């Protein structure tokens, strides 16, 4: 009963892509928080399970497909099925263990990775860190192929680990920042795959912090200024949600909205 999104790496365009960024966001988001025209995620606390979760069923020119779950809370990969297999990051607490297993029911497989799903640790396994990661279509379509081939033995931990670091950003980042969601439209524009800049890394970086400050501000100004980098790795002082309005596309719940 989950919702599913569909996009494939086969003849992307930046409409066919936009198109798909816009549909996560919306099965992400209800209307109902909004906070200095930003959208806020819907909070955990009393989330009915039933509304927990969206997949994203990725296809590419390979005709493979795979299956992500992601948290609405967060728009976090959880994990993903691909054919009689399913495979979920450890969880980080007894509350999201049972939540997963509330998706991909009927799958043959069940498997819980003994690691968690974070940049760091996937970063660790792939032997590469998200700045010598290339993003792209090409990218994309090769990492699909990458978790489809996994529970037959084809694919190596690190390429796995690297395959899920290109679709984290190129889903989850891209949902959560239109600034983001911009750099991967311009590769797919060109169909030139290149790494993440400091602006890009900074932001995912910056995420939470970003999402409390906003929410924490007084009418939209910060207590405290968030540093970020430009495209060169030069500082970028963030001292007023104003500026963010046309970078991020959604916040995460981090406290209720002031009266």
């Not at 607490?93 to 991909?104: G, P, R, S, V, Y």
């Amino acid at each position: 009963q989950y919702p599913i999104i569909n996009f494939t790496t086969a003849g992307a365009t930046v409409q066919s892509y936009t198109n798909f960024i816009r549909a996560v966001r919306g099965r992400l988001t209800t209307g109902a928080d909004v906070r200095h025209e930003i959208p806020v995620l819907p909070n955990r606390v009393g989330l009915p399970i039933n509304q927990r979760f969206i997949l994203v069923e990725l296809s590419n020119h390979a005709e493979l497909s795979v299956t992500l779950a992601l948290d609405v809370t967060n728009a976090y990969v959880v994990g993903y099925r691909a054919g009689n297999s399913a495979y979920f990051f450890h969880p980080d607490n007894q509350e999201d263990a049972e939540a997963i297993t509330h998706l991909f029911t009927d799958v043959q497989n069940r498997y819980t990775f003994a690691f968690g799903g974070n940049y760091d640790r996937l970063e660790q396994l792939a032997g590469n860190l998200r700045e010598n990661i290339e993003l792209g279509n090409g990218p994309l379509e090769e990492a699909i192929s990458a978790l489809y081939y996994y529970s037959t033995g084809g694919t190596q931990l690190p390429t796995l680990a690297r395959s899920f670091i290109i679709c984290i950003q190129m889903i989850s980042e891209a949902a959560r920042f239109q600034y983001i969601e911009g750099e991967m439209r311009t590769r797919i524009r060109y169909n030139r795959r290149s790494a993440p800049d400091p602006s890009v890394i900074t932001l995912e970086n910056s995420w939470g912090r970003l999402s409390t400050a906003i929410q924490e501000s007084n009418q939209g100004a910060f207590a405290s200024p968030i540093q970020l980098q430009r495209r060169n790795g030069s500082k970028f002082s963030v001292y007023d949600v104003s500026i963010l309005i046309p970078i991020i596309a959604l916040m995460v719940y981090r406290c209720a909205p002031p009266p």
